[PDB]
Amino acid sequence: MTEYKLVVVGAGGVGKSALTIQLIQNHFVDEYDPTIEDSYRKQVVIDGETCLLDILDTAGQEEYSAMRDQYMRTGEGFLCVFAINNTKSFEDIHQYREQIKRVKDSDDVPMVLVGNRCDLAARTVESRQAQDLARSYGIPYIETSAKTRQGVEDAFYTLVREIRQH
Numbered sequence: 265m266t267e268y269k270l271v272v273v274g275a276g277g278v279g280k281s282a283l284t285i286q287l288i289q290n291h292f293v294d295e296y297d298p299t300i301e302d303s304y305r306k307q308v309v310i311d312g313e314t315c316l317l318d319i320l321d322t323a324g325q326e327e328y329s330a331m332r333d334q335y336m337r338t339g340e341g342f343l344c345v346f347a348i349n350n351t352k353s354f355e356d357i358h359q360y361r362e363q364i365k366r367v368k369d370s371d372d373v374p375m376v377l378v379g380n381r382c383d384l385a386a387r388t389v390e391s392r393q394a395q396d397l398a399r400s401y402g403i404p405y406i407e408t409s410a411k412t413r414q415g416v417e418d419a420f421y422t423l424v425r426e427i428r429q430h
C-alpha cells in the first residue's frame with residue numbers, strides 16, 4: 265500500500281469539503297461546517313496500485329494550525345480549488361499558487377487546478393480562462409461537481425498521477 269499526501273486549498277465556500285466528502289463517502293453534503301479542518305483517508309486502487317490517500321481539507325483564515333502547517337510542508341500534491349460561479353475564488357488562485365511555491369521553494373510542485381460547482385448554470389469563469397491559468401502554471405485543469413460527482417475521481421486521481429511524475 266502506497267501513501268499519497270494530498271492537500272485541498274482554495275477560498276472559503278468553493279466546495280473543498282464537499283469535494284473531499286464526495287470522494288470519501290459518495291454523497292453530496294451541502295452544509296459542511298465552514299470551519300472544520302481535518303484529514304481523511306481513502307483506500308483506492310489507482311492504475312493497479314493500492315493507495316492510501318491522506319487528504320487534508322483546509323479551512324480558515326488569519327489563524328494558524330499545527331496540522332495544516334505540517335501538511336503544507338510535507339504535502340506531496342495540491343488540489344487548488346475555485347468555483348466556476350465564484351470569480352473572486354478564481355482570482356484568489358494566484359495567491360494559493362504563490363503560497364505553495366513559497367512552502368516548497370519551487371515552481372515545479374504537483375498540482376491540479378479544480379473548477380468546482382460545474383452543475384450550476386451561468387458560470388462566471390469560462391473553461392478557457394481556467395485552462396489559460398493552468399497552462400501558465402504548467403498544470404492540468406479539471407472541472408468538477410461535488411453534487412453530481414462529475415470529475416471528482418478525475419481531479420484526485422490526476423493529482424496522484426502528477427505526484428508520480430515528480
Ligand SMILES: Nc1nc2c(ncn2[C@@H]2O[C@H](COP(=O)(O)OP(=O)(O)O)[C@@H](O)[C@H]2O)c(=O)[nH]1
Nearest residue numbers: 276277278279280281282293294381409410411
Ligand atoms: N450545486 C453545487 N453546490 C456545491 C458544490 N460543491 C459545494 N457546493 C455547495 O457550496 C457550499 C460550500 O461548500 P463547502 O464544501 O462547505 O466549501 P468549502 O468552504 O470550500 O469547504 C455548500 O453550500 C455546498 O453545498 C457543487 O459541486 N455543486
Ligand SMILES: [Mg+2]
Nearest residue numbers: 280281298323
Ligand atoms: Mg470546508
